[PDB]
Amino acid sequence: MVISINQVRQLYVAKALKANTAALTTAGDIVPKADTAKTTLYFQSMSPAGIVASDKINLKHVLYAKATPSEALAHKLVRYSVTLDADVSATPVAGQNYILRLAFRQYIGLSEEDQYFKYGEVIARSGMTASDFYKKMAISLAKNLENKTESTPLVNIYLISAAAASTDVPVTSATKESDLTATDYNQIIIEETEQPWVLGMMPQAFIPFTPQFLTITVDGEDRLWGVATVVTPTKTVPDGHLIADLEYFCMGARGDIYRGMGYPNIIKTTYLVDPGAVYDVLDIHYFYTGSNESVQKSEKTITLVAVDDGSHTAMNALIGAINTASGLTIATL
Amino acid sequence: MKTLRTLKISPNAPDINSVWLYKGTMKYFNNGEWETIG
């Protein structure tokens, strides 16, 4: 990814927290270093190549220092619950094409003027219950969206048997009617998908979508056959792929900007972010001011990352150290 | 003499120059009313 900088941003990974400069042996170790006077602050980090230290923070020129949790940075996957509106009819209406249109705004491009429409069709028959209809519709949706041919993942279709309103019975183009032996299906959930990601070339994006229904003649009048309502998401996309591209960008500030450019004549940067983990973050904003005419500020950002075990143990001890060292009182998330 | 030549399926009554079909009942404008049929 590329981000907007307030004149600079540095990133440092905190894999292990040590208590001395001598204990820095492994490439992810880190120490918050400050003096008893509480006048400056810096971090001693262990790099693939030797120890390094961050720019020194004047503890009187700190603008804000807040630790975000990992939950805050996980993109929630918006999901709808699609049904048929009991005002038109609580059951399918035979001979009518129950079409369903799914619009996609940020398709391959990145604008809202780059749209993409995929469809799902079901023609109803007499004796067709609602469960049978939802089954057939989810199946026709998968075959058109979750196929082995579409260049990109678009949606995750599911089914919910009212006997178990929690479990989201999944569906894919391989799934067949017989694999769905329930009779109390009551909705077609449609959830956005994690798009593919490659470090430093494909930012973590999503394709948002709205389900648009179509008309059916029920008693002589063209009427919409369903109602799409958003429900509280239940699947979140972690920040591993996000911190990783952050590093990729913020490590070209300390180091090389010619990443892989002239392939054999390059500086290969070694990165410590695992894109399969879950990091908390600790961003600290500060500035430097000069002497007696260079009073203009130079705001400079520094952020730290640390894996999350679920209880934020790594970052909590991290800042507890920074607070014992710098007098600050950052809050232990 | 009042000859109707249209039937309309709807949940709201149509013009009085037509018959009104709605889910098991038909109605035609007779005596200033929509007179059902048995």
Side-chain angles (χ1 to χ4, degrees):
Chain A
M1 91 180 48
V2 190
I3 59 176
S4 85
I5 48 167
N6 200 354
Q7 280 206 352
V8 69
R9 192 179 187 175
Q10 298 293 337
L11 176 77
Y12 298 80
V13 190
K15 203 178 290 187
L17 188 79
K18 305 315 195 89
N20 313 113
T21 311
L24 303 196
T25 56
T26 313
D29 311 333
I30 195 71
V31 180
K33 298 294 287 188
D35 47 10
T36 59
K38 318 268 179 70
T39 174
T40 195
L41 181 67
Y42 65 100
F43 302 97
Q44 269 176 335
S45 191
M46 199 74 222
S47 182
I51 301 165
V52 287
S54 65
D55 187 14
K56 278 70 185 175
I57 298 165
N58 177 211
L59 285 178
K60 278 164 43 175
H61 292 355
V62 185
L63 301 172
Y64 62 87
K66 188 180 179 297
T68 202
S70 64
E71 291 85 4
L73 296 174
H75 190 271
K76 313 189 157 290
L77 293 166
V78 57
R79 59 193 272 156
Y80 299 76
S81 177
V82 165
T83 70
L84 54 88
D85 49 356
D87 291 331
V88 182
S89 184
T91 69
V93 160
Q96 296 309 127
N97 306 158
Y98 281 66
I99 294 166
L100 178 50
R101 162 177 57 199
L102 282 72
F104 298 96
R105 300 195 287 284
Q106 295 157 335
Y107 183 74
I108 299 296
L110 74 164
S111 195
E112 303 297 330
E113 291 180 352
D114 267 0
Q115 287 179 354
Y116 195 68
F117 301 124
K118 291 301 289 305
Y119 291 94
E121 81 181 25
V122 166
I123 193 165
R125 302 304 188 196
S126 295
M128 181 190 251
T129 58
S131 65
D132 306 345
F133 176 77
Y134 293 141
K135 202 182 288 173
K136 295 202 172 56
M137 176 41 97
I139 291 291
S140 172
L141 280 170
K143 293 193 190 314
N144 284 277
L145 304 166
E146 314 189 12
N147 45 356
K148 312 196 318 202
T149 316
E150 187 61 27
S151 282
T152 62
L154 297 166
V155 289
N156 305 129
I157 295 90
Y158 298 82
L159 277 161
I160 289 188
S161 165
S166 297
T167 63
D168 307 345
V169 175
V171 176
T172 176
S173 159
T175 316
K176 54 183 77 70
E177 297 292 328
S178 52
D179 308 337
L180 304 151
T181 49
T183 81
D184 44 358
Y185 291 139
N186 49 5
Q187 40 195 340
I188 300 306
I189 295 92
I190 306 174
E191 189 154 9
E192 44 170 1
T193 50
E194 178 158 13
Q195 291 281 306
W197 166 81
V198 55
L199 185 61
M201 297 203 201
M202 178 171 272
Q204 179 174 356
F206 294 85
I207 309 181
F209 77 103
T210 173
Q212 292 188 10
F213 308 87
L214 276 190
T215 66
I216 53 163
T217 58
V218 64
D219 274 331
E221 42 176 354
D222 293 288
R223 286 183 77 187
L224 280 68
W225 64 264
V227 56
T229 185
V230 307
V231 293
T232 191
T234 45
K235 315 285 183 140
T236 60
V237 184
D239 57 358
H241 294 203
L242 216 53
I243 307 315
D245 265 326
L246 194 57
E247 193 195 6
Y248 183 99
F249 181 75
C250 292
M251 281 278 295
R254 289 138 69 177
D256 171 66
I257 66 169
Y258 294 122
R259 282 144 289 207
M261 188 64 203
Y263 170 43
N265 311 288
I266 68 166
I267 318 298
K268 183 66 74 176
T269 318
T270 286
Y271 301 112
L272 303 156
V273 175
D274 186 7
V278 186
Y279 306 100
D280 315 324
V281 191
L282 166 56
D283 183 18
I284 295 159
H285 204 49
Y286 54 109
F287 66 88
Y288 165 87
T289 179
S291 286
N292 309 341
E293 64 281 21
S294 59
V295 59
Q296 292 79 21
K297 302 188 204 215
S298 288
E299 290 151 49
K300 44 181 68 158
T301 315
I302 189 182
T303 180
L304 264 70
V305 293
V307 296
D308 193 4
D309 61 358
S311 63
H312 318 97
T313 45
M315 183 58 97
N316 278 1
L318 199 151
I319 73 192
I322 289 171
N323 301 349
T324 307
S326 62
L328 303 185
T329 41
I330 307 178
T332 66
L333 53 81
Chain B
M1 190 181 196
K2 177 67 192 277
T3 187
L4 303 174
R5 58 192 80 206
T6 46
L7 292 79
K8 311 241 185 194
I9 304 162
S10 299
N12 65 52
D15 183 28
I16 59 170
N17 287 316
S18 286
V19 169
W20 178 24
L21 297 156
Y22 182 53
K23 70 186 301 304
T25 85
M26 57 177 291
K27 293 209 192 90
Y28 64 102
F29 198 51
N30 206 53
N31 304 147
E33 306 183 7
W34 293 97
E35 177 148 21
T36 197
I37 285 156

